[PDB]
Amino acid sequence: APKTDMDNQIVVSDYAQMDRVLREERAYILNLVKQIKKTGCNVLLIQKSILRDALSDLALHFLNKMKIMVIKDIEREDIEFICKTIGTKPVAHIDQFTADMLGSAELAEEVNLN
Amino acid sequence: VLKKLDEQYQKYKFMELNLAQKKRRLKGQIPEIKQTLEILKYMQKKKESTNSMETRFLLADNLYCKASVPPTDKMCLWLGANVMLEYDIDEAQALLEKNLSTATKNLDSLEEDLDFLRDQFTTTEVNMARVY
Amino acid sequence: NLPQLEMLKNQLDQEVEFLSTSIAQLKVVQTKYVEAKDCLNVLNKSNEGKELLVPLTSSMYVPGKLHDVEHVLIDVGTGYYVEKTAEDAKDFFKRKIDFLTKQMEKIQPALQEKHAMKQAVMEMMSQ
Amino acid sequence: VEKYQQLQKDLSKSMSGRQKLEAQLTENNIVKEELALLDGSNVVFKLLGPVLVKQELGEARATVGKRLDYITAEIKRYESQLRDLERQSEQQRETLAQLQQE
Amino acid sequence: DQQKINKFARNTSRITELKEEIEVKKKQLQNLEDACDDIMLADDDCLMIPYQIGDVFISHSQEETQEMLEEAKKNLQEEIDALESRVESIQRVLADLKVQLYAK
Amino acid sequence: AFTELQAKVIDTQQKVKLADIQIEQLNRTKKHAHLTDTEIMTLVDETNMYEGVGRMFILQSKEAIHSQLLEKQKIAEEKIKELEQKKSYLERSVKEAEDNIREMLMA
Amino acid sequence: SAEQVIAGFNRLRQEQRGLASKAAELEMELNEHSLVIDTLKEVDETRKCYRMVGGVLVERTVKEVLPALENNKEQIQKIIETLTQQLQAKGKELNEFREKHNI
């Protein structure tokens, strides 16, 4: 969830408010993560935690565990070559995040080999 | 005469204090018994054994202990009033579904009568402080 | 002279009972760390595979056979849950039995000055 | 005028809401020792909100640290709510009670 | 005396009587889903996520816990907009009693 | 003087009445312990008899109850002695210290 | 002198406070028993019946629990009115012994 002083949207200055803060901070970690597999994804291109504000691992772990292929912190110029050459269309946003603007990789593999 | 109002004053004092208790007793009971329906229904696998799932024993106020729930197929239900009965899978559902309807109905009539009751109490309460 | 020492005797008798109030409930919660410690014995001692009744919720109990006597709770956090060894819990129960017992003997001496000062207020009045 | 007492209420009301969670403040450090008094011998969970949630010992003191963040701050709230609400009460004694005499 | 005030005090009492109940409906649904707050961040569905039902639990993935909780939330949110119908109803009849008291 | 009187009388008062609820409960427990065994054994047969010191109630043998009520009624029989003695003797020092309170006050 | 003046109020402030909440405490058990005779007796009783206190649970016959339940509710209905009669008598001498202090 978008950053101010932290990676998540959680900044706790009160518990009476924290119960009240509990309510709406539960989504972003769930939704966009699930939205990845709601549209469905076998892969995920993600720019770097420096290139993108914060990447919740607690969200990305469940996002990984949804058995999408996450490349977290991936370089943009490969993404560029991914976008144009193999046709993974730009998603900068949820308005732009669909199953279609996703490239379809006849195979995608994390390779420790070679 | 002072004799007319104090009869209302003392009786409306006893009944307004009594009915609001059962009005509140019928108040808290409506969600509670219903939640126990659903808790039971979560636990019930109908035409099967209820509560075959995980459990943590409640030993006393400060303590839990992990265990496995599944019993012979019955559910003990807390009545109050120094009485509890055994209840089976449906016999738990039989009493429990039933008390949801009863506790729901008896409030508003007890409330609406209490509404005019304290309308009788406070109205009488005004004239008594006049004389004495 | 007399009424001024009357109402102050009246007020200090609340200080009597308020500390008498703060000690009394403190013994209950003491004993429910006992009662939790108490139930942990009967549980641990009995057996595995025999029926129980532990409260399901209001209006119901949930029965079942006992297993895992050693996995326990010591109430902590906000209601945060922990497991300990069954002997770890008894001590923490007893530790929480040991704690509340001292505030009792902390309250009673402060409960005493509320009597004597009250009586000292009465003493000038009566005498 | 009630502007004494509503404030005296606002005084007296949050006086306890402050001091209420010192118990769960203590309990959040108690579990941390219970997390220390275990090496993982007995798995720790969390109840705030109904369901049971498995928690790593690191996640545990992260949770009870959250649960310490679910406590410490609501204790810190009141001390200012003590003063004005007796004072502005006394200041409403210096206004509304002054409003009465004139 | 007057016959209005004791009836005039009836709607006022049922205002906050009914109005406050939405809070505990929120706070539960608020706190009921804290059970969801805790589960996806730490402890995902690689393990089991039990949904507490009374004294016993139903163990299942990250998902079914956020489901069986949602229905405990879902049933609770319906009475919110069902009660606010009667909550907002009781205040205006009070104002309707505020009209005819000034004459008597 | 009334300065020292309030401390002496309350201390010994809470010493004696301790041993009282200490002794009298043991007898009443024992006396009430006779009831539950007669309550279960009145049934011709029962498949469920639960024992607990709290909101947990576990299935256990009816034979284990009488022996659990054996030493219990034996220990409750043992403790009463000094619990009468700590009541009987410590009853003295509270009233003896409470005597000069009102009578010197009434005078 | 002023001794019973300070005692009488203090006596009647303590016990009437103590007997203030004892009147309706049974009346909720009255409500609880009037509830159970309405809720429990409405469902069938063929079932093994329990008398429960905090510590221990007793196994009982379906018949044997009946003399315990309603006699309590009647024991409830009986002594709620008499203790309340004793409260109003305290309130008179309490106010009697309060005014001498607040004079």
Side-chain angles (χ1 to χ4, degrees), chain B residues 86, chain F residues 35-50 62, chain G residues 46-51 58-65:
Chain B
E86 292 180 350
Chain F
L35 179 63
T36 58
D37 290 344
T38 58
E39 285 171 341
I40 185 52
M41 292 178 71
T42 301
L43 279 67
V44 58
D45 183 67
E46 177 65 19
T47 60
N48 298 131
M49 178 64 181
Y50 295 138
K62 295 176 180 177
Chain G
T46 58
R47 300 289 293 174
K48 280 73 178 180
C49 295
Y50 299 143
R51 178 189 293 176
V58 175
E59 179 68 20
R60 302 176 71 188
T61 303
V62 64
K63 62 187 182 69
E64 294 178 349
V65 177

Side-chain angles (χ1 to χ4, degrees), chain B residues 18 25 84 86 88 98, chain G residues 27 32 39 47-48 50:
Chain B
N18 280 278
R25 181 64 184 88
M84 176 179 283
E86 292 180 350
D88 290 344
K98 180 182 63 62
Chain G
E27 295 177 350
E32 181 66 15
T39 53
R47 300 289 293 174
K48 280 73 178 180
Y50 299 143

Side-chain angles (χ1 to χ4, degrees), chain E:
Chain E
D1 290 346
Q2 294 178 336
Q3 295 177 337
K4 301 291 183 290
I5 293 188
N6 297 133
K7 304 293 183 292
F8 172 80
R10 179 55 184 162
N11 294 132
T12 300
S13 295
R14 289 178 294 181
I15 291 187
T16 59
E17 181 180 2
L18 298 174
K19 179 58 163 59
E20 184 278 335
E21 183 178 1
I22 298 104
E23 182 68 13
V24 297
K25 292 181 182 299
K26 298 299 184 181
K27 302 299 285 186
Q28 290 180 337
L29 184 145
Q30 171 177 346
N31 196 341
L32 290 173
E33 198 185 7
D34 184 8
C36 292
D37 177 68
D38 290 345
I39 51 183
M40 195 202 82
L41 289 176
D43 187 12
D44 286 333
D45 62 12
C46 56
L47 300 173
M48 66 191 86
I49 311 301
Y51 169 73
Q52 177 167 354
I53 54 194
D55 192 9
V56 302
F57 300 159
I58 177 176
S59 291
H60 40 66
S61 293
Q62 179 68 56
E63 52 191 342
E64 290 297 321
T65 300
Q66 295 176 335
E67 302 306 321
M68 300 174 73
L69 283 169
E70 183 178 1
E71 292 178 350
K73 295 171 65 70
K74 177 179 73 181
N75 298 132
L76 179 61
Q77 181 61 59
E78 293 179 351
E79 291 180 350
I80 295 180
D81 291 345
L83 178 65
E84 290 177 350
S85 296
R86 185 176 177 84
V87 175
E88 188 176 2
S89 297
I90 195 82
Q91 65 176 19
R92 292 181 295 102
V93 177
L94 174 64
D96 292 344
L97 294 178
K98 293 180 180 297
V99 175
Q100 296 177 337
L101 174 60
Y102 296 140
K104 294 181 181 298

Side-chain angles (χ1 to χ4, degrees), chain G residues 23-88:
Chain G
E25 183 179 2
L26 296 175
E27 295 177 350
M28 180 61 73
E29 293 178 351
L30 171 64
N31 293 335
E32 181 66 15
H33 300 177
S34 295
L35 178 67
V36 169
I37 65 177
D38 289 344
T39 53
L40 167 61
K41 303 294 178 64
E42 189 181 1
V43 74
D44 296 345
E45 298 177 351
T46 58
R47 300 289 293 174
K48 280 73 178 180
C49 295
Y50 299 143
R51 178 189 293 176
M52 176 170 172
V53 296
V56 298
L57 177 61
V58 175
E59 179 68 20
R60 302 176 71 188
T61 303
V62 64
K63 62 187 182 69
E64 294 178 349
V65 177
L66 295 176
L69 306 181
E70 295 176 351
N71 189 29
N72 290 336
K73 185 180 68 65
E74 185 65 14
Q75 178 62 260
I76 284 150
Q77 290 179 334
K78 288 179 177 178
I79 60 185
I80 55 174
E81 60 186 343
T82 300
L83 295 174
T84 301
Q85 294 175 336
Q86 297 176 337
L87 187 147
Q88 296 295 100

Side-chain angles (χ1 to χ4, degrees), chain A residues 9-26, chain E residues 30 37:
Chain A
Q9 194 170 356
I10 54 181
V11 290
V12 51
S13 64
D14 182 66
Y15 170 63
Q17 294 179 336
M18 189 171 182
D19 283 342
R20 291 189 290 270
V21 171
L22 284 173
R23 191 177 70 197
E24 301 303 321
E25 197 275 335
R26 294 188 287 263
Chain E
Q30 171 177 346
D37 177 68

